[PDB]
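TEACHING EXERCISE
Course module: macromolecular assemblies
Task: Read the component lines below, then compare them to the predicted structure of the full complex.
Student: A.B.
Group: 4
Components provided:
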Amino acid sequence: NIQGITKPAIRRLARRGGVKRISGLIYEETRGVLKVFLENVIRDAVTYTEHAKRKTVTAMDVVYALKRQGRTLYGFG
Amino acid sequence: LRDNIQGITKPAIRRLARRGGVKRISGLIYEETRGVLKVFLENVIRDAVTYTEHAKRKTVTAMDVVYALKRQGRTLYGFG
Amino acid sequence: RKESYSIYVYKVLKQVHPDTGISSKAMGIMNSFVNDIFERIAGEASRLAHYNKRSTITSREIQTAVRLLLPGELAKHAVSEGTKAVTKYTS
Amino acid sequence: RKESYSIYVYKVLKQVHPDTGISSKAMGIMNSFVNDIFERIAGEASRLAHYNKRSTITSREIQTAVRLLLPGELAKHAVSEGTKAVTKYTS
Amino acid sequence: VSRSQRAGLQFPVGRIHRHLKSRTTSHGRVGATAAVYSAAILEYLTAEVLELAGNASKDLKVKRITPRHLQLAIRGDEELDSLIKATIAGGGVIPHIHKSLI
Amino acid sequence: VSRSQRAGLQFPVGRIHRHLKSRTTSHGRVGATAAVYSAAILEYLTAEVLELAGNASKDLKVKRITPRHLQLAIRGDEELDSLIKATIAGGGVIP
Amino acid sequence: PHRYRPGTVALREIRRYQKSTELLIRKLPFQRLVREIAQDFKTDLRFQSSAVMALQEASEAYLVGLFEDTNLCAIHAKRVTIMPKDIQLARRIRGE
Amino acid sequence: VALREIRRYQKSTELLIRKLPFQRLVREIAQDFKTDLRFQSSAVMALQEASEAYLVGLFEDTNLCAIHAKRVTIMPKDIQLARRIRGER
DNA sequence: CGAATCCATTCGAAAATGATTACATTCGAATCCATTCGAAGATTCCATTTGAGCCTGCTCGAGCAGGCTCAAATGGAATCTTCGAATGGATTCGAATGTAATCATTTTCGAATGGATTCGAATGGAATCTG
DNA sequence: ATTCCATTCGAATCCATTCGAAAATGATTACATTCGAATCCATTCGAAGATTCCATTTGAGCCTGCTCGAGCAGGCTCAAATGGAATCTTCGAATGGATTCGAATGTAATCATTTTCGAATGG
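Instructor-supplied answer key:
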């Protein structure tokens, strides 16, 4: 399902980042980086959910995990 | 006390660079190194003096420096 | 029931800009900002009280925590505002 | 008088390496390391207890705190050790 | 005769006292003049951020504040940028293009 | 019979219980097995670090342990390096 | 046959995507990816929508910052094209 | 001879800056925050250790940046880039 | 060879036992939201191929700036001496915070709408690639 | 001469500011008692001098390796057009799991004794 993050989406993210020219092997590197980041965050989100004896992942577990990682987020609680 | 930043001589910077793994060094590196060292020292000493002043003391101890370092994220082991 | 900081944020906004409004998402962001800053100050004050083998938290601890946490040219004005408020409250 | 973890560190060292000594500076390093880890675990456990609207700290909070902080295989091993101790304590 | 009116503020003093008393470890007391200091600090910071955001909004000929204006106001000031390192949901990035790319 | 002897440990359980009780906010209670869990974790980590440092000392033909050995042991392991990011006064650098 | 020289439309999209504030990845593929990744930790989970949206916002911000650092590294070596080595150097210096 | 110095200074553990000049610099810097101050030897030692570790790490990152651009000589550009990516300035 | 590591010891500070209460956590029900699931449709993004010019990598000549050697002088180390500056501990006391009742606010949640805010056009104001 | 875009008019649409009801919860008065100032006194401890060998630093010269600029060729990313997938929107039953409210237990904190232990000092 990692192939659902297409090449034009990476081009748009690069453009917002300020990149004028892009190589041809950037996309796979970006996909790997994104997968690693997502795994790291989701691990802690699920740990927080399991401690509370629940089966539904809420927004506050994600907020707490992001704050733990050092990536505080404003707007969701 | 004036112009004490020039006591960080060229050989000392060369030794630190050698331990860092540097083969060749430009001639304009020393001024940049002195500037960055001054900034680092100023921040840490400011925090240490704040910690000392809160306790109504006149002597700067090792624990003030340890706490000031831990505040920035530069934890140090072996001094307190 | 649930408590928040919306009333006071709206009061301050109407105090500084009497003809400008706010939205709901900006209100949520402001609430998060206030909660975060409060948690930081409280934690630093507790640690400062613990270091000197004390039990009570006073305005000295708050002043030192503000001096340690806020960047320069913001610590001076904040300390001035707090000192003025305490002096007015006492008298 | 002041407290320290010197006796227990020496006992553990005599358990692992029965013929090796340890200097004073390494002892100071180990004391600092132990204090750091203990403070981290205690803080995380307090936060976990607060998030769930509870007042008692139990072994479940310690287990979850260990799971959050320690990386990879370490955490797994640590958990096992702790569990064993509890089973030997209650019986 | 509320304590906030006596101090001359808008943020509460009793509620801040109640909140401070719940995070003081064990057997920890809280003085009555710590709440005044904390309320004054919070009000000052809020007023600063709101003023900058209102100026940024008025520069664009609109009559409301949105997270975009909050991000624009925060990232344009050095002290506020240094103090706040969180992610504002709905702000984007400040436009900037390198000289060698044009 | 001490609680540590019942649990089979070397680190203290009563002292750790007393230390944990002085961190709970306002009226906060602490169980009796939280101390046992904490003592077990601390003892395990200490034993691992000491074992690695002793192996390094045996490699370097020294009977004693110095901060150089601790730095070598800590920086040579992936998880120990990940967990410990502090500065050891007297270690140097890894070649 | 009107044509644009290579490099103008790139600047046009740079301005267009730096002026806006929306999200750039589609929602359904990201939701599917999140579910597949999370199924390796616990079976039969459920997700609030807000959790997925928070994850998407964080991911997008992370990628934009990483690309800014990559562009800096590419400019250092006297180039305008970004390559995998720039990403590797930026991530190595940042501590990741 | 440049590699011999690297091999010699990577194996040792002592300090590389002289003690008296560093102590004088520390006192001169601290003069700006409070007059008529006193120090302990432990405070100066802790400051020296921290400073040396910081400089060595910075020089490692600088060497990486210099190698990226196909060179062996380090310049101020590399220091500026390393401090910019770390988010120090 | 000597600067450090290890063992003997007496005593206060602190941990283990035993009742006793309350306080907090556990074990059924009963709504009732809110997440998973299935189906149909207009269209807007996305995937693939063709043409081509601009950016990247490599070679060669030229300058330039860093490392290596040597002699002379300098400023950091190293070992007492004086002292006078500053912590640290005891013992009152005086300032200040918590606890218990009793109101009288004050803040939170659920409807009502007039205005600031999205689509849909619009032609003026550039921006551009070819002459 | 061909496209593209900040900025300005309609238009149904959306939403932020008022307005009421009522349940927490501050604010006042009167004890009780922790807790932190305020003086005095011991002693470590940090600062300022004096006196040298000897190691470390600093100019001065030489020259070779390293970085820089220019002319070329080939690798390769961009721009445009045509089919064709698949996300987005809306609707509707079927289903699962948080959340609140009573009762019945499990367990941790608080005194009163007794006793084991580890921190400081020598050797």
